[PDB]
Each structure stands twice: as structure tokens, then as C-alpha cells.
Amino acid sequence: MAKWVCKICGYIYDEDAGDPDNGISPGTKFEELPDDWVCPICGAPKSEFEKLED
Ligand SMILES: [Fe+3]
Numbered sequence: 001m002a003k004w005v006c007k008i009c010g011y012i013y014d015e016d017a018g019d020p021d022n023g024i025s026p027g028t029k030f031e032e033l034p035d036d037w038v039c040p041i042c043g044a045p046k047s048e049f050e051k052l053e054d
Contacts, residue, residue, distance in 0.1 A: 001014075001015030001016045001027065001029065002015050002029070002030065002051055002052065002053065003015065003051075003052045004030050004049040004050060004051050004052060005049065005050050005052055006039040006041065006042060006044050006048060006049055007044070007048050007049065007050055008039065008042050008044040008048050009039060009041045009042035009044065011039050011040065011041040011042070012052075013030055013033075013039075013049060015027065015028060015029055015030060019033075019037075019040055021040065022037070022040050024037070030046075030049065030051070033046060
């Protein structure tokens with residue numbers, strides 16, 4: 001699945017990993033993260049992530 005970078009801190013949201021510590025099962029696409037999900041490292045909103053693809 002895809003990977004997304006937090007433009008602020010460099011955390012990688014890896015769709016294959018999800019974010020289970022913060023309520024997100026492995027396999028959850030970035031689009032499906034709740035609107036108020038934030039970077040677990042720096043707190044940046046979803047707007048600050050960039051999909052790692054051309
Ligand atoms: Fe971040």
C-alpha cells in the first residue's frame with residue numbers, strides 16, 4: 001500500500017502499518033484516516049502529509 005510523509009517532521013504514515021496506538025488498524029488508507037487524525041510524532045494535521053509517489 002502507499003506511504004505518506006509528514007512534511008513537518010518526517011514521520012512516515014505507512015498504510016500497511018496503520019497507527020494502532022492511535023486507533024488505526026494496519027491497512028487503513030490515508031484517505032480513510034479520520035479528518036482529525038494527526039501525525040503521532042508532531043501533531044500535524046492531515047493537510048501536512050504528502051503521498052510518496054510521482
Ligand atoms: Fe509529523
